[PDB]
Amino acid sequence: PSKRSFIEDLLF
């Protein structure tokens, strides 16, 4: 996916 949407999944 997009970058920002991707780091959100990891942090959560």
Epitope: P1, S2, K3, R4, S5, I7, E8, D9, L11, F12
Partner: antibody, heavy 126, light 109 residues
């Protein structure tokens, strides 16, 4: 453009409950997490709660734990906040916002989106 | 309960002056600090993130520095639109908490 609008604000007696809603438009609501931040009159900002894009992980501030519940519906591009057992100190302007996450560099990034709604006033008084 | 100590609480300066606002974290937040601007009766505006990056649209006179616990937002020659209240945020603990500074009021001298 991208716009977040808050609705459902008003007055509520202490001890009772009240539900907030925030409608998002102009971008993929499922591609970003949502936050609630309040601001008491004359005071600073205070982050309240966050919902992930998949609506599975919830986190609340310690002051509102056990009282506030946050939900979302990607089909309506809306994020909700059900506030229960409200107190006078909860009186603030509640902003529905999409905040900047870490790990983002390169100043002109399209993934550094950080915009706020105009906010709604919730008055807890008796 | 990550705390951000902002200083000064209030500031006064004239148009064309240079001012510095500092933010102090209670623990190592790396470079994940952001600077916000808020005008009376309006929602906050993001100015700086990653402690040095400029959000799209903000003029060059807004600059930030710092890593770890001490951070510094420096504004070059001021403009009338620049006189407002500023806050610093941290995103190191992004999932479970985001905290703000108490704020600095920039008053026109």
């Amino acid at each position: 453009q991208v716009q977040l609008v808050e609705s459902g604000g008003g007055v509520v007696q202490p001890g009772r409950s009240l539900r907030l809603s925030c409608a998002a438009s102009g971008l993929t609501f499922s591609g970003y997490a949502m936050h609630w931040v309040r601001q008491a009159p004359g005071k600073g900002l205070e982050w309240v709660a966050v919902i992930s894009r998949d609506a599975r992980n919830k986190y609340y501030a310690d002051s509102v734990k056990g009282r506030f519940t946050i939900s979302r519906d990607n089909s309506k591009k809306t994020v909700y906040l059900e506030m229960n057992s409200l107190r006078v100190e909860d009186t603030a302007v509640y902003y529905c916002a999409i905040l900047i996450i870490p790990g983002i560099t390169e100043p002109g990034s399209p993934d550094a989106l950080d915009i706020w709604g105009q906010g709604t006033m919730v008055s807890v008084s008796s | 309960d990550i705390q951000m100590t902002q200083s000064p609480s209030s500031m006064s300066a004239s148009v064309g002056d240079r001012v510095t606002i500092t933010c102090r974290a209670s623990q190592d937040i790396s470079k994940w600090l952001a600077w916000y601007q808020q005008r009376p009766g309006k929602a906050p505006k993001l100015l700086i993130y990653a402690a040095s990056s400029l959000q799209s649209g903000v003029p060059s006179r807004f600059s930030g520095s710092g890593s770890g616990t001490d951070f510094t937002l420096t504004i070059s020659s001021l403009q009338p639109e620049d006189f407002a209240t500023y806050y610093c945020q941290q995103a190191s603990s992004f999932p479970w908490s985001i905290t703000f500074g108490q704020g600095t009021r920039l008053e026109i001298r």
